[PDB]
Write a protein that binds this DNA or RNA. Structure first.
Ligand SMILES: NC(=O)CC[C@H](N)C(=O)NS(=O)(=O)OC[C@H]1O[C@@H](n2cnc3c(N)ncnc32)[C@H](O)[C@@H]1O
Length: 529
RNA sequence: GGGGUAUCGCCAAGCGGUAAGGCACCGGAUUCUGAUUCCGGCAUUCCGAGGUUCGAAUCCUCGUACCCCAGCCA
């Protein structure tokens, strides 16, 4: 339960409503991010819990900013998250003829007029945060004049910016939004839904409330920056002949540490090619998190955990990581893979190889076991072997022995370095029957795997606050390593995450993994202290 | 100027009856993943200062910090 649900409950109780109807109204001007998922879980989540409906409306009132590629990705992400919308996908465009008629009503009611104030002039007349604005010299045109002018506008008789339809409210209002807000503006641009049928388009504030009313929304849930806007929202509905009046409620938006959360900034990363694309695994986008290896479930849990309030907030990366770790820890089958390989040949080994038993999950034997090949020539992580120090160091020491995961106990006795001093191979000896722990991969039965290690996209906790957020990008956000994995991963498919032993959770796809060279994204490493 | 928010490192319950929970952090027990699990600990005070009441994070007063609004964007 949260404050929004309490209002809903109170309404149901008081009999103000008998059903709940919400909506998720994104603008198709970019892809969705973890922030939009908060909105998605709030709106769709509420609807299904109260046995109600929730629409997926595309607020497409600004053609020049929107694109068809975006509507498709938004639809994909919502479905991927596991939510279904009521009826067909709605579009603000669907109400264009309707909005137009309503504007005409306002005009006949003397509550809207066509303004000739240039785009610069309108601001000059608008006033400031401390000084009231002033009435336009065109504000008193007759109803007939405005009617003609609006049609002139619609008919495309005016050039872009040469005129606009504004609401006649109060230029001396403390709410800057109520100072004769523009209802319509001229844009001779093709619309992705209505083609070139329109040259004038409705503004967000005029559109949004009427869209909600027509769809019969009971609770329009948006973020805090629209609190001022509610005044206009209510003004519009209170001044037109519309049978319902949905109520707007605002909750604080999500902010994630080390990443930016605005389509504007995210779009810049894509446009400047600083990331592969919107779906890049470093991106805080849904598709990006998806390609990164995050489960829709883990994301819904995150939204559940972060809550819904009116307090500004910035969630730490550790919270999101905990969610995906919880899920994957419980479901992802374990395996063997080496990021920094160094050959470790057991000189004590006779033959070509054998096959050992390994649980698909150590704490869950019901998940089964597999048969992984063992040999005299294996691969191990360079971070596992050390000729020196600390009693705490549980891994392979130059004078000690270490248990190989689900296998025998080796014991390094001789190492082989090179000209720069780098070790090429570690000669060891295995115990006949012995079945610190370390993972490994048989050199003979080894699958050439490309491993991509991701990290925080930005060097600072609040990159959005940087003067040039781009200059603070982490150069090590992506570190492509080449390693070896057990032959099992040969049959690994994109979509499933395997937990590489002692390294983290990984998954195929990467948008690069082929048949010869499989690419694996590190969804997230394991907890290490 | 108007609109909002102040509770642990980060989130968040709380709605006159005596500070939940999560993430995180500090200990101890297990583990063939330094993982998992696992028991034990972690705000005598809620932005500050007065006031009210038997009792206040909750009510009252004055202050303070931060966030949003001057697109023909959403
Ligand atoms: N009344 C409204 O919600 C405005 C609708 C507008 N088309 C709009 O905001 N479009 S949008 O594409 O920008 O986003 C759609 C929804 O997502 C919410 N949102 C956007 N960023 C968010 C964030 N960081 N955290 C939480 N919610 C966030 C918007 O409020 C909107 O409901």
């Amino acid at each position: 339960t949260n404050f929004i649900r309490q209002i809903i409950d109170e309404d149901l109780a008081s009999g103000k409503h008998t059903t709940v109807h919400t909506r998720f109204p994104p603008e198709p001007n970019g892809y969705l991010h973890i922030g939009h998922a908060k909105s998605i879980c709030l709106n769709f989540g509420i609807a299904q819990d109260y046995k109600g409906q929730c629409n997926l409306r595309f607020d497409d009132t600004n053609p020049v900013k929107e694109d068809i590629e975006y509507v498709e990705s938004i639809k994909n992400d919502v479905e991927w998250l596991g939510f279904h919308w009521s009826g067909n996908v709605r579009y603000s465009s669907d109400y264009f003829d309707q909005l137009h008629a309503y504007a005409i009503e306002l005009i006949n009611k003397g509550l809207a007029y066509v303004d000739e104030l240039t785009p610069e002039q309108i601001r000059e007349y608008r006033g400031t945060l401390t000084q009231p604005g002033k009435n336009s010299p065109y504000r008193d045109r007759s109803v007939e004049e405005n009617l003609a002018l609006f049609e002139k506008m619609r008919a495309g008789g005016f050039e872009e910016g040469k005129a606009c339809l504004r609401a006649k409210i109060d230029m001396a209002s403390p709410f800057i939004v109520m100072r004769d807000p523009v209802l319509y503006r001229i844009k001779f641009a093709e619309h992705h839904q209505t083609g070139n049928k329109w040259c004038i388009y409705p503004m967000y504030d005029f559109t949004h409330c009427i869209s909600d009313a027509l769809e019969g929304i009971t609770h329009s849930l948006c973020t805090l920056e629209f609190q001022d806007n509610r005044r206009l929202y209510d003004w519009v509905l209170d001044n037109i002949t519309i049978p319902v009046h949905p109520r707007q409620y605002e909750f604080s938006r999500l902010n994630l540490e080390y990443t930016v959360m605005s389509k504007r900034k995210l779009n810049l990363l894509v446009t400047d090619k600083h990331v592969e694309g919107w779906d890049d695994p470093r991106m805080p986008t849904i598709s990006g998190l998806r390609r990164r290896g995050y489960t829709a479930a883990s994301i819904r849990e995150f939204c559940k955990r972060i809550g819904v309030t009116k307090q500004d907030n910035t969630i730490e990366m550790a919270s999101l990581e905990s969610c995906i770790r919880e899920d994957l820890n419980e479901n992802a089958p374990r395996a063997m893979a080496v990021i920094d390989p160094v050959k470790l040949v057991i000189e004590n080994y006779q033959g070509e190889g054998e096959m050992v038993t390994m649980p698909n999950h150590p704490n869950k034997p019901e998940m089964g076991s597999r048969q992984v090949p063992f040999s005299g020539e294996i691969w191990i992580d360079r971070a596992d072997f050390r000729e020196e120090a600390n009693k705490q160091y549980k891994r392979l020491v130059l004078g000690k022995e270490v248990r190989l995961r689900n296998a025998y106990v080796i014991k390094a006795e001789r190492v082989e370095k090179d000209a720069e001093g780098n070790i090429t191979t570690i000669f060891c000896t295995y115990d006949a029957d012995t079945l610190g722990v370390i993972h490994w991969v048989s050199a003979a039965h080894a699958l050439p795997v490309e491993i991509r290690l991701y990290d925080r996209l930005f060097s600072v906790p609040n990159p959005g606050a940087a003067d040039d957020f781009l200059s603070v990008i982490n150069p090590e956000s992506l570190v492509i390593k080449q390693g070896f994995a057990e032959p099992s991963l040969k049959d690994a498919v994109a979509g499933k995450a395997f937990q590489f032993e002692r390294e983290g959770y990984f998954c195929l796809d990467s948008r690069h993994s082929t048949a010869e060279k499989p690419v694996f994204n590190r969804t997230v490493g394991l907890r290490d202290t």
